[PDB]
Amino acid sequence: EDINWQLFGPNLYTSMVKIAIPDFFERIRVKGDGNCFFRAFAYLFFDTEEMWDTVKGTALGYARQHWSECHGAKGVYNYRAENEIKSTENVTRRGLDLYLEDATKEGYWGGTDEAEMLASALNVTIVIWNVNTDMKVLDVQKFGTDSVPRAFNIVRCGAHFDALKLINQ
Amino acid sequence: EDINWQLFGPNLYTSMVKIAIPDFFERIRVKGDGNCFFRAFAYLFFDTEEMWDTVKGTALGYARQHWSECHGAKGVYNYRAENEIKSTENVTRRGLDLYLEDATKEGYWGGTDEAEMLASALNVTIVIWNVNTDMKVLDVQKFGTDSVPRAFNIVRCGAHFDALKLINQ
């Protein structure tokens, strides 16, 4: 059960451990729309999918205030912000604006960039297990330093996220 | 036929188009060792998987010269360098050296970090189709701006990469 985690970015770890999810977790399906990541985390953290919007507001509020710590989102949007200016205080400002313009839309697909913001915003550990259709682990990453049993575990299959709860606990 | 690509990183696109690979591509199997990504790309690009080593050399030589454009790999190795140092420019030089120390080993598993390098180094588009074990697409990434029929298409099933050729051409 002891898993070796290697450092992969700020507050971010990966592992090579390969398991079948169903032998340790119960999977809880959430609604298949563009908010599934927010619903899955809201289900584990607040015990209901219906708080996805609070989860989403928490993530975006954290970005507004700690943009320099959203390495996933800023990696994409700060790069793209430099390439509108020629068309370092003020690029990263514009990158945050571009991110917020996308993320505030109703159609936005939450995912791994927002998992990083929630883990820091709430001081929790979020594990994202990427699986195939047979629920076999293709890879796993983890924002935060807690162990898998002390963490909120999410499963990704292609574009869709669901929640996982550990069986024995 | 027409896929809508979402920007996902610098020169990196994603899509949730869902297909069966055998309906559009013939798949060409390459040797199943840690060089299979290089072998898959060498098969499409140079018509032989035995130029995998030139492909690898292309990717790593590109990284030596363009480390700051190697967004996937530099995210990992620049962070590891800056935590080695605690125990903006000295960091990234160390990060590249850490990357090369892993990547130049014969046992290194090439993959998306090097797809990004090859796409920029050679000015081509590489498409990575992640499939489950029955070859149904889970999701797909594209390094570069060309369309699927003008790109080098690679299928990935867990850790293993093979080449894809489009049936129509």
Residue numbers in the entry:
A (entry chain A), B (entry chain B): 2 to 88, 102 to 183
Give the authors' words.
One specific mechanism used by nairoviruses is the production of a deubiquitinating enzyme, termed the vOTU, that disrupts the innate immune response. Interestingly, the nairoviral L segment also encodes a viral homologue of the ovarian tumor protease (OTU) at the N-terminus. Instead, the vOTU’s primary function appears to be the reversal of post-translational modifications by ubiquitin (Ub) and the Ub-like protein interferon stimulated gene product 15 (ISG15). Each vOTU possesses a seven-stranded beta sheet as the core feature, with five major alpha helices framing the rest of the structure.
Viruses in the Hughes orthonairovirus species possess an additional 26–30 amino acids in the middle of the vOTU. To assess how this additional sequence influences the structure of vOTUs in this subset of nairoviruses, a crystal structure of FARV vOTU was solved to 2.22 Å. While possessing the familiar core domain and secondary structure features, the protease possesses extended α3/α4 helices that are connected by several intervening residues. Thirteen residues could not to be built due to a lack of well-defined electron density in the crystal structure, and those that could be modeled possess high B factors, suggesting this region to have a high degree of flexibility. Additionally, the α3/α4 helices of FARV vOTU appear to interact with each other in a manner resembling a coiled-coil motif. This is facilitated by hydrophobic packing between Ile86, Val105, Ala82, and the aliphatic portion of the Arg108 sidechain. Looking at the selectivity pocket of FARV vOTU reveals it to possess more of a hydrophilic character and contains a relatively bulky Gln155 residue in the equivalent site to position 131 in CCHFV. Additionally, FARV vOTU possesses a potential steric hindrance to efficient binding with the presence of Arg170. Removing this region reduced activity towards Ub-AMC by almost 60%, suggesting that this motif could play a significant role in Ub binding.
